[PDB]
């Protein structure tokens, strides 16, 4: 699979976002509990709960594709489905709301990606969507400083950054520690108070943002300059002109 | 400089470019007379009423940035928002009643009936007559049946009756009260191809009461208009009150010469005619006057389209026919504040006028690709200079329908032709999502990733000239951030030609009226003007209730 | 036949059923499956006894929460069914030997109406079911128990509602899989103002089978609306025999390549190595590390597109046995082939835009819904032609009980009695013998 | 004595019973002190906008006869007919407004979304919560985002939601601010009976701001609904800000446990929900609230349905929505003023209980005949005994109006069944027709004529039930004189019964609410309150005006 | 022109606008092929032909 075209490193980047072949890099680690705590569905050690019966409790109609399509654990247990959502800093963040969407279809089964200019979202069951949580929280797909957990108000994608480098948060979910150089998560997504922070880890350095990011600007790669990139767009619009009129 | 710095500088601390800011100290609400004012009502209502209302501690805590002024555009004129909200600006409001409550009729058919069928002379001095009756009538008032009760003459001074004609000599003759003098209103090189359009033709512009409007809707407008031209046709021209050939009034009235100004919708979004999804781009468009009083700037022409249709499609008609609450003030303000798309619409127009100049470029894919690209390059690149800019238009929607609108009227500028200048509106998006992975809400390019297959399709429900589509075009029907730009778009071509209308000519010489309530001319002025609570509306029942 | 192309067809269970046919045996206007279904859906109602009965004995009558104090009537209505039946099928019948069908179904609590085809021939459009159905029973209740003139109008709002004060059978206890004609958003759309979850309910939530059902009407309705015609009717052909009767096997192969592990991303790779095997494309040129795909068949290359998107939101919603999904397969299975290849997604980006508002319009507050509420009239999923929809159903079909507003819940009654029709419960099954039946006389 | 005697001898000089007096030395239009106004006020309207508008010398000359005051029945209030011309009074705007503004959505589904599929608790704390929520949210405030600009909160203070529900237990655990108390504003039978009609269920009555209802359509009222329900459920419940299962609320409160005060029309009459064509007469009945605080007089309880009924389907629907211009005051007016459609109607009342008692005589038309005969011919010979009567209602359709509603009323009072007073009603105009060899105007009798068939019949778009039929019932949808006398004739059965509602329960708890600004449990005095210009309405723009 | 759109189409058809609709676009290709009328030019012949809809 190519995933995307273009000869910049956003291109790359975003073609390795894509690729179930490449290993997202690992920047911290962070405990079951701590993502449970992070993503406010259930309290750390509740039970699931369900919204309809097992599936082997339940007898499915015989359904050649059911029968060739293996479920995700949480659907086979019978899970609510639940989200995870995170906003991107236009300033160099290294996930985008466009380039996450199409990593997770690509990397992920059974996910419901949505994209807005403020907030990315996947729905799935409730068990595998706290295993997909973890990725997108210790990879690089995840900066304590340019990227935010938020359930809601989830404003700052394009606001300027604060005096530390943090994005704005209208409920300050995720503090930035002065005196250590590191970011705490007081809150979770939706915005409830934790007992217990989580560390999130130290901001990746601008040289290192710049690195991994996956948005175009002009003081980083501009879109432009990537003319290969610009010239598969401008294609699929001229193909897709051309096929609607389709009486040449 | 960039026009949008001034705004800039007066909305933020910070100089335009800078990239950091402060937050969380502002107060919250308290940093705004506004919200301070909408605090201190809450407050008032609820404890009259007994019923908890507006509250600044229910849900989150607005202000934790700054919460901008706005400058109107082409204006010195900066408010918060709020003011710019349809509900608290009685000039947006009075915008639409003058368009809903605005009905064309033609008087042809009508003369031939009086002199064919009940064999009577119509002259100018019978019309004039009829005038003077009609704008008795047209208010509610009585002209044939004893104790009859009307409406009271202060409560519907906004209703009268005008006409026009392309015949100078014939409009000589009427009374200059009830003509609407093409001659005066416009340039002469749009005057004489507007008075070519009509010709002999007598047209009607039928106002019925604001008042009325707001009590009913906008199907009322052309059967109000119906029944007072037929009851001043019985009166003026001696006929039976009640014959047959009363019928053939009617139906002419309501049916054979009638324009309305929006067409009635299908069941799921069922209204009558004259509501603002049945407008369609063009009629808008002509319906903005800048047109005859700006002709030698397109840009300016073609944004006054662009503002006169972000507030009607997207605060008025999206944000409240089709949805309602807090609404799309800023979806719509986006694209009328800050000269921001001024800035990058001007650009555009420089850029085509110095490779092609206007309306000189082939019109074709080509051009498409040449000015959409270079215009949307342009603008997304002063959302990366200036942070301050990014941050005042937060919205990736807004964005998105500024560049575009700028993309597609230049496009439009190079071409004259709408079509192409609407591929070039769907091309900046394309490149606009890939540049910054990102593009507006959740369903904002539903119509946008239809676009590029669709604006030159020729299938039943998918092919249309620009200027024909509307808020009812199927891909078109949900989602702000594109109708009033489309509106913008359809006149970009025209301006740049130097076209006296876009789409209608009679819906153009239509508004051309100072008896309106608001000024056409200058949509962007008025916004302001309500923002400051400095417009005055018809339609207020004051004169009916206590002190 | 107009068309060179031949398809090999292939059942439910992914066994080849006749190979080389060709592909006009499959288009609405030969194929007499089709025109069967297609004149079922027009001519069939069914009849809630058992509420018309429990409306009567309580004035609930003519919508929600609405009563009439004082106007009560007891009658065994169900307690009577056969002979009520017996004597309505009497008056919705033209001849003894036509083809009317009344069936009653929950021991009397349900009726099967199928109105006779011949009172079609000689009407506009398809009201004539509902309405001689809804006469027939009011007379055939009066009758049965000599209701009298004063009360019998309440029998006549317990049937149909408050027609005509509304427009709809506001409150009616009989039901159909058309809505009426006004309803339409534009002309030609009556076949596709047939929610998602009618077809799922009809086709007892067979995954393949609810995929050809609304494959057949969506494309059907493209035939109407006169979008299958000239220049695009070979399009909208291939549309049908690809996406909607797996034909050639590409949409049951891709998933069972991808069943197990896979992706939207993997059945995308898988697919475009199909087309590139197949000959549907071939590199048109290179840039550095990318190769630009191009094809001298858009129809061909959309079909083998349309399927993959199809076996894509099988293997996506499948594996998580939730429909939610299918907006998000249906927007990022055709941007991402776009950018994987050079080459326009399905349907020229129409699939695209049609998920986009999808999702939005099953993700907020502003209208839509759940997935089972959408259809081709919709103004939200009605601008893709027949592309996007037939997914919809699908991933309804795999829904193993997340949704709130699900076929048990807007349309129990169609799933009662509907599902009763074998052409309707297993359309593919019938269009495949039609089309083999005929692949000689094509 | 006789109900009118005291209007007529207040309206004339001579006495009701002289059959001779003298005109055309009034003065015409200077005998009345509202023409006189009027002229005034078309002068100064007309020197102001350059326009003539108002001029009595227009057409036929007003007041060759007595230009009469009107008596507002059950009031000692005397006005001009221009006072009750529905453009003139507030009063019957706002009560216009206030069913136009209004809609019923359970919480039910909603309810059952927030277990099943989100999996969180219901209570009536949550509720509570959400409830204050909403109030802030829904006359157009926000909840969740940064940056939001926000509706006046004095421009819209009219605007809030309730709820109520049959269970007394989970009734008073809600704050009792938000809570319509059945059991305060029902009588007891009648509370039990509206109590047990809702059960357990929990139903919100919201109001969207008269000012936005003026500013768009009655098709706006569910969506803006829905909007705001939506934002207080994400905030009250913690979901994500637009998930999956936001859409499940949406559908809920759009379509699924929406209940629209009208339904909307097909394309000739094309408009949306909550227009007055789309509300059927059953509705009508239940929106007054007369039954709730008159319930011992049937009569009373029958003839305030049948002033609101005649005000809203006469003078605001057919005589503006549908027509406009003077329009048809008068004609409703014959149907709630001088006291004469109270004197028939409790003749016929009086009749029937003397003969049969009320609800028992047998339904069928042997009562038919019987009733709708005697009091026909009582009201007639009103008209011949007092030429007063037969000058003050001097339109033969006033007076069929007049006539036949009180003997389908009278006829229903009989049988307990509203669809044989309809057809005492139809007899009533057959016999007026023969005995004056006159009926109403051109077109009147159109569902006359067909109306004794399609009393009974079972037949498609002919059989319905009176309560469910409406403005949109075929026959019906054209002519004056019949909607709101068949609203009454709807009430008049259940009001002798003593049901607590004609149609649906939850229409009649919806505005049996305090916080509305119209009184529906006093119609016919607020009209006369509006006529004074003592009637304050909500959706004034005053306070963003300079004045 | 007189136009009898075939008796097929409606046999498979929910009602009768496949009469108006087909024939619509049938004229409409046919003048685009008659005169090879440009991509950018094609939407006029389409508006001469089927008027405002789909916006009215
Ligand atoms: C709750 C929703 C889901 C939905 O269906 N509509 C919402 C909310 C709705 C509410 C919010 C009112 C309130 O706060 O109580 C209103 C005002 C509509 C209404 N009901 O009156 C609205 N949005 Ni929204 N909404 C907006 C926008 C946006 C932008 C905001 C991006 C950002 O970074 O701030 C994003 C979409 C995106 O990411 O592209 C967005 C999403 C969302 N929007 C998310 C909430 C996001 C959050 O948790 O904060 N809106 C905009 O992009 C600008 C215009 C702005 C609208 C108000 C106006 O026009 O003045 C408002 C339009
Ligand atoms: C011009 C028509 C034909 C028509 O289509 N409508 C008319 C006139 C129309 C106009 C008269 C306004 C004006 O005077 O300028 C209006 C007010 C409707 C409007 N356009 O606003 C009206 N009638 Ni008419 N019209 C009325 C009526 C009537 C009665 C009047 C009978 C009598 O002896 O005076 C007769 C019909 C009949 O004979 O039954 C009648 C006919 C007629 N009516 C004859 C004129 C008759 C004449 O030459 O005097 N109206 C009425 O019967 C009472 C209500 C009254 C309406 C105003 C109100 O409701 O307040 C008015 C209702
Ligand atoms: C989709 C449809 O909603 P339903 O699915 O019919 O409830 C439609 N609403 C809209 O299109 C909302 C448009 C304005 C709000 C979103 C603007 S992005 C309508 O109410 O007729
Ligand atoms: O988040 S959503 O895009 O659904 C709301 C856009 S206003
Ligand atoms: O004169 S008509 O009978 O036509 C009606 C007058 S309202
Ligand atoms: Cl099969
Ligand atoms: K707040
Ligand atoms: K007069
Ligand atoms: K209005
Ligand atoms: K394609
Ligand atoms: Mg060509
Ligand atoms: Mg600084
Ligand atoms: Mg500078
Ligand atoms: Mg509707
Ligand atoms: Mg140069
Ligand atoms: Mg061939
Ligand atoms: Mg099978
Ligand atoms: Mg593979
Ligand atoms: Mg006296
Ligand atoms: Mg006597
Ligand atoms: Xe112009
Ligand atoms: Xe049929
Ligand atoms: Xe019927
Ligand atoms: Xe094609
Ligand atoms: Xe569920
Ligand atoms: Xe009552
Ligand atoms: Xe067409």
Redesign the pocket.
Known sequence: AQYYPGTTKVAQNRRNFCNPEYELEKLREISDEDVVKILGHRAPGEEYPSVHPPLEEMDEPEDAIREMVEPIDGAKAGDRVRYIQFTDSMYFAPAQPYVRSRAYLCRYRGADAGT????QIIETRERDLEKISKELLETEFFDPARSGV?????????LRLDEDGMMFDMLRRQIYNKDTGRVEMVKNQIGDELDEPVDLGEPLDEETLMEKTTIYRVDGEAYRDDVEAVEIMQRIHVLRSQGGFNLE | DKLFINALKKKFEESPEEKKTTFYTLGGWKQSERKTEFVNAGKEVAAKRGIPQYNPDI?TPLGQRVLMPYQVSTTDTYVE?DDLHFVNNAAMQQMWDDIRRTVIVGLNHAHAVIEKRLGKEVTPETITHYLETVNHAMPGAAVVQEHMVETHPALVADSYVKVFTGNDEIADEIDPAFVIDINKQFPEDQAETLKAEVGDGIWQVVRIPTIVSRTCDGATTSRWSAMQIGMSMISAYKQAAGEAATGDFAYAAKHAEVIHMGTYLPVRRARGENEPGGVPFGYLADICQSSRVNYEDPVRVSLDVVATGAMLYDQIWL?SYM???????????AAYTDNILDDFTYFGKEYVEDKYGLCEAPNNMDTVLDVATEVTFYGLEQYEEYPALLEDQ?????RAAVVAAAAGCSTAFATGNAQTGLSGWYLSMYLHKEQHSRL???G?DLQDQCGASNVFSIRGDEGLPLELRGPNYPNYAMN?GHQGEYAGISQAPHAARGDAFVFNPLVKIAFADDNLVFDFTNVRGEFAKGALREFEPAGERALITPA | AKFEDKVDLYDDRGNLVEEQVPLEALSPLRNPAIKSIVQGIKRTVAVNLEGIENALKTAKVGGPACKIMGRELDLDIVGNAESIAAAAKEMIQVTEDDDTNVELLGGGKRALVQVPSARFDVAAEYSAAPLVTATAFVQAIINEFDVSMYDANMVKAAVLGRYPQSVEYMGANIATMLDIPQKLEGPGYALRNIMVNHVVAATLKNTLQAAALSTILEQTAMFEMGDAVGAFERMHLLGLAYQGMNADNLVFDLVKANGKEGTVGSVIADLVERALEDGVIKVEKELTDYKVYGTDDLAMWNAYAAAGLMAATMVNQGAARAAQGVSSTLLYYNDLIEFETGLPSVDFGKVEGTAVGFSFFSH???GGGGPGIFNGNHIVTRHSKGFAIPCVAAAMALDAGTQMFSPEATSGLIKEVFSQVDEFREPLKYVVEAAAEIKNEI
């Open positions: 807005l200019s403020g907030r938020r359930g809601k108000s989830v404003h700052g994608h394009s | 849900g928002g944000g949805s309602g609450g807090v609404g799309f003030t800023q979806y719509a303000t937060f919205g990736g929607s807004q507006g809400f959740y904002y702000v | 907020s507050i502003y």
